[PDB]
RNA sequence: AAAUAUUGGCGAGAGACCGAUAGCGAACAAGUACAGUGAUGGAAAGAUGAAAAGAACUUUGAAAAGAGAGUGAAAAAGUACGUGAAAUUGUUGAAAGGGAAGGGCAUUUGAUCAGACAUGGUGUUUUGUAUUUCACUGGCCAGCAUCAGUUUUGGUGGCA
RNA sequence: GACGUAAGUCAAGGAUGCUGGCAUAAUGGUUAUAUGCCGCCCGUCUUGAAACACGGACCAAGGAGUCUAACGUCUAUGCGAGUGUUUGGGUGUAAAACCCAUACGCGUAAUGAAAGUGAACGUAGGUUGGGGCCUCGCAAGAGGUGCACAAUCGACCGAU
RNA sequence: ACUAAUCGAACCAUCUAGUAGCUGGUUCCUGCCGAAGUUUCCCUCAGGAUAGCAGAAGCUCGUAUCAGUUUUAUGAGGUA
RNA sequence: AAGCGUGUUACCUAUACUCUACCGUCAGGGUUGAUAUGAUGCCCUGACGAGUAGGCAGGCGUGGAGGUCAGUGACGAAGCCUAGACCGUAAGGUCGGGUCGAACGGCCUCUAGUGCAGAUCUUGGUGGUAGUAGCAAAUAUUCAAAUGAGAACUUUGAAG
C-alpha cells in the first residue's frame, strides 16, 4: 500500500517495434537495433526511432527538400539519410549530385538523381558505407502539412479548417461564420 | 472480419459496452441532425459555424462545364513536355526553336504564376493567364497567346 | 528419465468452479466470471471462492510439466513420434485417442525401442 | 500431425552446479557433553535408558556405551541432539576407544539384488563390548549407587517439569 | 429491335448458405390436420436394419404381454425402432443427517488414482568371441552438522 | 573481500555434506463426510439489495451491437504529384484469373456572395529554441550547419 | 349500451420489425489502465450537446518553461 | 470488577509494514569479425499489481473456407456419460474406461447467423405441490340367474 504520484504499469508511450509485418522492414530495425546497441553514435539511435515511425509520421520527402537541404555550407559532401519514403519534385531543374539513403525510392526519384548523376541506396548500403553514421545528415518530411491537420484542435476563435466533405457557397458561410448573420466564429 | 470485432471481447459483458446506467437506447438526442438548434446548439456553433442561413445569391441551373478552370502554375509548366524531350529544350535555350507546350489540350485551363521556371524561351497556350504568370514567362524569354 | 526440475509447486491445485455451480443444473462447472453488481464472489468477499488470478500462475521453469517431469507430447503415428528421438529427456509420448489398435502396437514398439516414455501405453490394449 | 511441433526445444544438456561455497567445519558441542560424562537416550530403542558418552565421532554422532552387562545396551553410536546429559561423570581415561570409528560401525553393502521381501552378531562386537566394558566396571564400582541409577531407566514422573528439572 | 427490369411460370446450373426449433409456413399424405360465422389464422410430424431377415416354434397368462428359442454383425437396432444428453424417476451401492442444504480455508477418517530407478546402468572371463549373472544415482519422506538471508528469545563483557 | 610471505583457503555475487526408512497408496491428488472458523440468493434498477424491491420451479435447444451507403481519427499495404483495372472491352481452364484505352473521381490553389482575381524582394525571409551531423576539443565543452516542430514578426494570394 | 366471450370506436390482413428521452435482457477467460454524477445551453429536470474526469494511438525531446509543497520578499482581502 | 478515571509494561492479530520464493505488467538494459537453432527469442536489474461503468492488449472455444501434416478411422470417427488422470491462473485442451456406429482432427491463415443463467425470454419436456384437491345438485337402489378370465355398473327376471 503506497501512495502513487503517477500513473503505474505505464507504458513508455512510444513504439518499440515496428507493427508492420514487413519482413524486410524488420530486417532493417534488426540490423539498426544491434548498431543501435553496440555503438555509442546517437545516429544510429535515431534512425532506429525513425523506421518505427507510421505512414503519416514518416512523411515523403521531396528531392527538392533534399537539394534544400544541401544547399547549407558544410553540407555539400555529406550523404542525406531519409528514413521513409523519397518522392521526386517537377520544380526543381538542376539537382546537384549526392547519395541518398531512404526506404523506398519512387521510380521518378531514382531517374530523376540517378540522370542528375546521384546515387540512391538504401539503409544497408549505409550501414555499410557508414556505420556510425559519419557526415550524414538526416531529413523528415513536413508533418502538419498533412490533411487531416487542417481541422485538428477544431474550436471558435483558432483558425481551423472545419470537417466538411463539399466545400462552397451554402456550406458554413451563414450565421456563425460571417458577421453579418448571427456573429463571426 | 467479425471476430477481431470488440463485440466478440464484449461477450460476457452485461451492457456490451454501453453502460449500465446509460442503458443504450436507439436514439436518445433525436435523429439525424436534430435538435441543431435547440440541445446540440453547442456542437453546431462549435464544431459546424455557420450550417444556418443564407449566403450569396442562388445560381439558377449551375454547370460545371463553364466554370471548369484546372490552374496550373509555373512549376508544373515543364511537366507538360514528355520527359524525354524536356531536356533537349532545358539545355540549348534557343529563341527561334521554343518548345510549344499546350496546356489546354492537357487539360488546364488558367496559367498561375507560383514561378521559378528556367530562364529558356517556353510557348504558352492557355484561355486564361494571371498577371505574375506572364511576367515569369516574359522574364524567361517566353510568350504567351491566346486560344480557345 | 528427464532433466532436473525445480520441485513442482503448483501454489493451487483445487479446481476453479463456478460460482453456484452445483446449486444450479443449468451452471456449468467451467468458470465463468461472475460480473454481477452484488456478487460477493466478484467483491472477493471472505470465505468465499477465490477468482483465478496471476497469482496463481505456476513457475516458468516447471510450466506444463507432468509430475513425472515431461512435458507430453501428443502423437498420432511413427513419423509424429521420430521427432522426438533426441528429445526423448523433456518430452513425453501420448497417443491420441483416435489412433486404433493395431496403430498402437506399432508406436508403442517403436516407442519403447527409443527409450521415449509414453504417458498412455495401458490404453487399448488386447489380451 | 495431432499437434504440430514445439520449435524452441529445451536446453536437453544438463547444466553443471555452481560452485557452492560450504566447507564441512566440524561439530562443536555443548557445554554439558563432557567425556565419560552420563546420557539419557530419549529416543530410539533404549528410550530411557541410562548410558555413559564415551567420544565424539567425525560422524556428528555420539559414541556411547552403557555398560552392556548393566542396562544391555551396545556399544552402539547415537545422535548427539537426542540425548540429554546429566551432570555427573564417570572418569573414563582408562579404557581405549580409539579403534570405533565411522566404518567400524558400517552395516552392510546392500544393493537391490539383496531385497529381504521376507524380513546374527559378529564376535567382535561382543569380545570389544568386554574389553571396553572392563574399563567402566572397573572404576564405576567406587561410587556408591551409581550401577544401580545407571541400570535403571528414566522417565518423567507426574507433576515434576522439565525445564525446572536439572540434569 | 437491342442494350434494361423480372422474390411469378418452365427448364437448367451453382453456393466459404441452412441442416429437422435451422432453412420456405411446409425435407414427412403442408396451405394438410385443426380454430374461427367469416375475412382469415395454421401447426406438429425426417432417420430400424445392407437386407424385414419385422421375432417361426415352446411355456405362463384370458389376452396384451413376459420368459425362452431364433433372425440379425448388432434386438445396448423390435416398427413405442440411428446415437440417445439433462431435468425428472426407480433399483442397487456409498455417505451424511437435533429448525434448511449448499460453498471457502485446513486437516483428519474412508474410498480411489500417476509415479519412480528399480536404467545400456563408473562395465567384464559367453558352451567352438553382445546376458556384465553385485554397482554408479533420484523417486518419496525425514534426522543431524556446518552455513547464508529474515527474525525472535535470552546470558553476559566493556564503555560513555 | 578476508585469512594467509606466498600456494591456497574461506561464513567472500543465494546449500551443502553425511545418514536412515520406504519405494508404495507411504507422500500427495480427487472426491465424500466430519470438525474449527468464515460465507445471506443470484441478475438488475439504485446514493444504497440478503431485502418485507422486481425476474428467476427445473432441463435441453434457439436467443440479442450484424450488414450496408457515406464518412472521421488511428494503423497496415501499394503507388506516390499522382493515384483508382474490374461502368466497359479483350481473354479465360469460364461468376475465378490475367490484360487494357479514354474519360471520370479525389489531390495538385485559394478566395469572394458574385463579377472575378489568383500565391518567391530575399539562399522561400528574419528571430528564438531545436534532435542529428560536422570542425576543434583527451573529455566535458565551444562553435558551424541546423530538417521536423513550437511561438512570433514578417513577405506574397484572395476578400473589405 | 350493444354491434359474434372483443366496444369511450369491432375483427382480419397489410403499411409494420410503426414509435419510444421508458422497463427488462444483452452469452468466454485473463492482463493493464480506470472514472463520473459538476460547468454552460436546451419546452431542459428520467434525456441530450459542450467542458471536465478515463482509455488508447502515439509524437517531440532527455531532467527540463515543472509541483494540490515550504521559505524569503512583496502584494490583495474585511471573515472570526 | 471482568464498572469508572489514570498509568506501567507484557501479549494477541489485517490482504498493513520488512524479508524470501513464484507469477504477470511496466521501465531500464545485455545478447552476432564461426556465437546462438540465427532476435516479438533468451537473459539481467528494479518498481509495481484494489476496482464498477469503460478502454485497450493477449489468448481459449463453435459453424464453415484456402493450405499443409502423403494427419486420424469400421482392428471403431463423431457423439455421449465418467465424485478416473494429467496440463493451463482461466477460458478450455488431452488421455483412460463404457455405449457407440462413419466420418473427424492438429497447425498457418480466412470467414461468420460464433460462446448464455436470466429478457413475467421462445419451443419442447419434466418436476415439488401430489396419489393430494376433486370425481358431494338432479330423492335410489337391492337380490338372483346368464354371458364372461374378471360383474356395483352388461343383459334378464324379481322387487323398490
Redesign the interface.
Given at each position: 500500500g503506497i501512495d502513487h504520484t503517477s500513473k503505474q504499469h505505464k507504458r513508455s508511450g512510444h513504439r518499440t517495434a515496428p507493427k508492420s509485418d514487413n519482413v524486410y522492414l524488420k530486417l532493417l530495425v534488426k540490423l539498426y537495433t544491434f548498431l543501435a546497441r553496440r555503438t555509442d553514435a546517437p545516429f544510429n539511435k535515431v534512425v532506429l526511432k525513425a523506421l518505427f515511425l507510421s505512414k503519416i509520421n514518416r512523411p515523403p520527402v521531396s528531392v527538392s527538400r533534399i537539394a534544400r537541404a544541401l544547399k547549407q555550407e558544410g553540407a555539400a559532401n555529406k550523404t542525406v539519410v531519409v528514413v521513409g519514403t523519397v518522392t521526386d519534385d517537377a520544380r526543381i531543374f538542376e539537382f546537384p549530385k549526392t547519395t541518398v539513403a531512404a526506404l523506398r525510392f519512387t521510380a521518378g526519384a531514382r531517374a530523376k538523381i540517378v540522370k542528375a548523376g546521384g546515387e540512391c541506396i538504401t539503409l544497408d548500403q549505409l550501414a555499410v558505407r557508414a556505420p556510425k553514421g559519419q557526415n550524414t545528415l538526416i531529413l523528415r518530411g513536413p508533418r502538419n502539412s498533412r490533411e487531416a491537420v487542417r481541422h485538428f484542435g477544431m474550436g471558435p476563435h483558432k483558425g481551423k479548417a472545419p470537417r466538411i466533405l463539399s466545400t462552397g457557397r451554402k456550406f458554413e458561410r451563414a450565421r456563425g461564420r460571417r458577421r453579418s448573420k448571427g456573429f463571426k466564429v | 472480419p467479425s471476430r477481431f470485432t470488440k463485440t466478440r471481447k464484449h461477450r460476457?459483458?452485461?451492457s456490451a459496452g454501453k453502460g449500465?446506467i446509460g442503458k443504450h437506447r436507439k436514439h436518445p438526442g433525436g435523429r439525424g441532425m436534430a435538435g441543431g438548434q435547440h440541445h446540440h446548439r453547442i456542437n453546431?456553433?462549435?464544431?459546424?459555424?455557420?450550417?444556418?442561413?443564407?449566403?450569396?445569391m442562388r445560381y439558377f441551373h449551375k454547370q460545371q462545364a463553364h466554370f471548369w478552370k484546372p490552374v496550373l502554375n509555373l512549376?508544373?509548366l515543364?511537366?507538360l513536355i514528355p520527359?524525354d524531350k524536356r531536356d533537349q529544350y532545358?539545355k540549348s535555350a534557343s529563341k527561334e526553336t521554343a518548345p510549344v507546350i499546350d496546356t489546354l489540350a492537357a487539360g488546364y485551363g488558367k496559367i498561375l504564376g507560383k514561378g521559378?521556371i528556367?530562364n529558356v524561351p517556353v510557348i504558352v497556350k492557355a484561355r486564361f493567364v494571371s498577371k505574375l504568370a506572364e511576367e515569369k514567362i516574359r522574364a524567361a524569354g517566353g510568350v504567351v497567346e491566346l486560344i480557345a | 528419465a528427464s532433466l532436473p526440475h525445480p520441485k513442482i509447486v503448483k501454489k493451487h491445485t483445487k479446481k476453479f468452479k463456478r460460482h453456484h455451480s452445483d446449486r444450479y443444473h443449468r451452471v456449468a462447472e467451467n468458470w465463468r466470471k461472475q460480473k454481477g453488481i452484488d456478487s460477493v464472489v466478484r467483491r472477493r468477499f471472505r470465505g468465499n471462492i477465490s477468482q483465478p488470478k496471476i497469482g496463481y500462475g505456476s513457475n516458468k521453469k516447471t510450466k506444463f510439466l507432468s509430475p513425472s517431469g515431461h512435458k507430453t507430447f501428443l502423437v498420432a503415428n511413427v513419423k509424429d513420434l521420430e521427432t522426438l528421438t533426441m528429445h526423448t529427456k523433456t518430452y513425453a509420448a501420448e497417443i491420441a485417442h483416435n489412433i486404433s489398435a493395431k496403430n498402437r502396437v506399432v508406436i508403442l514398439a517403436r516407442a519403447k525401442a527409443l527409450g521415449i516414455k509414453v504417458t498412455n501405453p495401458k490404453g487399448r490394449l488386447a489380451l | 500431425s495431432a499437434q504440430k511441433a514445439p520449435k524452441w526445444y529445451p536446453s536437453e544438456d544438463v547444466a553443471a552446479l555452481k560452485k557452492t561455497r560450504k566447507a564441512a567445519r566440524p561439530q562443536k558441542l555443548r557445554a554439558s557433553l563432557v567425556p565419560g560424562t552420563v546420557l539419557i537416550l530419549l529416543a530410539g530403542r533404549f528410550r530411557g535408558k541410562r548410558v555413559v558418552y564415551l567420544k565424539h565421532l567425525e560422524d556428528n554422532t555420539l559414541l556411547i556405551s552403557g555398560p552392556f552387562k548393566v542396562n544391555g545396551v551396545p556399544l552402539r553410536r547415537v545422535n548427539a541432539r537426542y540425548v540429554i546429559a546429566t551432570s555427573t561423570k564417570v572418569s573414563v581415561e582408562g579404557v581405549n576407544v580409539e579403534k570405533f570409528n565411522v566404518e567400524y560401525f558400517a552395516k552392510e553393502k546392500l544393493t537391490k539384488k539383496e531385497k529381504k521381501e521376507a524380513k546374527e552378531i559378529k564376535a567382535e562386537r561382543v569380545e570389544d563390548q568386554k574389553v571396553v566394558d572392563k574399563a567402566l566396571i572397573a572404576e564405576i564400582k567406587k561410587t556408591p549407587l551409581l550401577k544401580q541409577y545407571l541400570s535403571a531407566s528414566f522417565s518423567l514422573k507426574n507433576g515434576d517439569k522439565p525445564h525446572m528439572l536439572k540434569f
Open positions: - | 460476457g459483458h452485461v449500465r453546431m456553433d462549435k464544431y459546424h459555424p455557420g450550417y444556418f442561413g443564407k449566403v450569396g512549376d508544373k515543364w511537366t520527359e532545358l521559378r528556367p | - | -
